[PDB]
Write the structure tokens for this entry.
Amino acid sequence: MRTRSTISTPNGITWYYEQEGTGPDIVLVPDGLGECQMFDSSVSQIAAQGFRVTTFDMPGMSRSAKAPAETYTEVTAQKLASYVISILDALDIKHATVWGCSSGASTVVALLLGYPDRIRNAMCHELPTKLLDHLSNTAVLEDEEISNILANVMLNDVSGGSEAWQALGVEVHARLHKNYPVFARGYPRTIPPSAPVQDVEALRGKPLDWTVGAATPTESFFDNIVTATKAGVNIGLLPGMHFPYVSHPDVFAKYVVETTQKHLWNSSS
Amino acid sequence: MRTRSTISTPNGITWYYEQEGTGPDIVLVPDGLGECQMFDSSVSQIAAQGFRVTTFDMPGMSRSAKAPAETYTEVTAQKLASYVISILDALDIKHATVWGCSSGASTVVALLLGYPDRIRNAMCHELPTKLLDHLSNTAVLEDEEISNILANVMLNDVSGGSEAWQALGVEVHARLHKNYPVFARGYPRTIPPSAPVQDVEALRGKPLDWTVGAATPTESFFDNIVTATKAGVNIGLLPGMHFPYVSHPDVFAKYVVETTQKHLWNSS
Ligand SMILES: C[C@H]1CCC[C@@H](O)CCC/C=C/c2cc(O)cc(O)c2C(=O)O1
Ligand SMILES: C[C@H]1CCC[C@@H](O)CCC/C=C/c2cc(O)cc(O)c2C(=O)O1
């Protein structure tokens, strides 16, 4: 029942994408590592509730690596939002609910603000607004040193579930290993300044639902809680840390389904 | 230069208290374990900046154990605030900056709201507003079981610095051993419903500075960040988790001094 295919957009990207189900569109945008197999279990659970679920590897990453250098260097939320709109156009997805974590969170907020006609509602998780010098500084290391250090960081610091993270398996981890240097060079210096949450009044009243991981150290996304509260945006927690779709796929799926259902009800009302 | 003494208040409590320094009064209210030796290093560092610093063991805890049962059972923020005002009265402290964590945070917000003429400014850290059934359920266990469970939770889960926690030393840990059952039976079922943060508008424009531990899991005090932001209260982070005065005593002392100095400037 799952479509697994490729599609090229006129900006030069050949995307790997997956699609399952029929009904209103839900689009799952990856975190900065750009790997959509992390959604595999949740895609089936969401689609089984009457939704068409689409996801894809991000440009330069995993199976979407056939892309121009512009699409994975000096990356901003606004560049990623333009890329996501390009694949939604190619797949004839006119109206979508969107989810994203990390750079995907910055992307879905940029999508909702920039393309309001196209986005039913956005779910953002752990949106990076601050530069982190220790992360930015990995960009000057050799590829194999970046891959070693960031594989260790993802497992031990932010996975929210070491058994589930390792259980992604060799094929996924081999793709992530090649993505770490692309991520490290392209994302950490340019994503946080692009954060589309600097104008709090622009967020007020928008169909946005914001989460942080329950186990994430308070300092990591303290600023997200403050910003969401100042904007009156619904803010809550998911179990785990940065990858709830890996650590707690059933809870993640239920959240996505219940939030989309809430916005479908409010759309008619 | 540290005074270490006792004082009796007419509510029946004989307090163990310490005091150091000369200048505006700063009062350090313990967390629910009620043990003021946790402030030892910070009391000297704060007093050295030109403050009279006072702290005390809480009623029924450590060296303030000579107290009526009502002061350490069915404990609320409003009861604790009334007890702290009693010791400030006895020590002739008319105007005070106050710090508290946990039940001490509930106490200092109840003090600022209930006794505004007495409180220059309050610093609250990690204020519990939710019942936690697993913690509440320790109340029905035997004393030795409560002490073993909670000693482990403090050391391994929420100290924010296990080496600094261990370094409080054998005497402090022997007092905490006896406090754990008193705390378990008197605090976790009654402190959260008494949280003086039900009325967001009552907090607005008050001289309150709120913190959460940087390493504390987001879910523990997520509600504090939301409430402070809704009330326009200054909200920030300290290093560590629930006991910054243990884990990071120099950062803690600098925060208490700089915050007190900010409110002394604004007062004038
Ligand atoms: C892969 C995730 C892990 C974040 C975990 C999060 O808990 C810790 C922060 C690590 C930084 C993540 C991040 C930072 C940026 O500036 C840009 C990004 O795209 C990310 C990002 O996508 O990082
Ligand atoms: C000793 C501290 C530890 C806080 C750890 C901090 O991480 C919060 C987790 C444990 C709950 C503590 C607590 C709960 C209450 O209902 C009442 C209280 O007075 C406390 C309290 O004072 O607990």
About this structure: The longest helix of chain B spans residues 249-267. Chain B is about 45% helix and 20% strand. Strands of chain B lie at 3-8, 14-20, 25-29, 52-56, 96-101, 119-125, 208-213, 234-238.
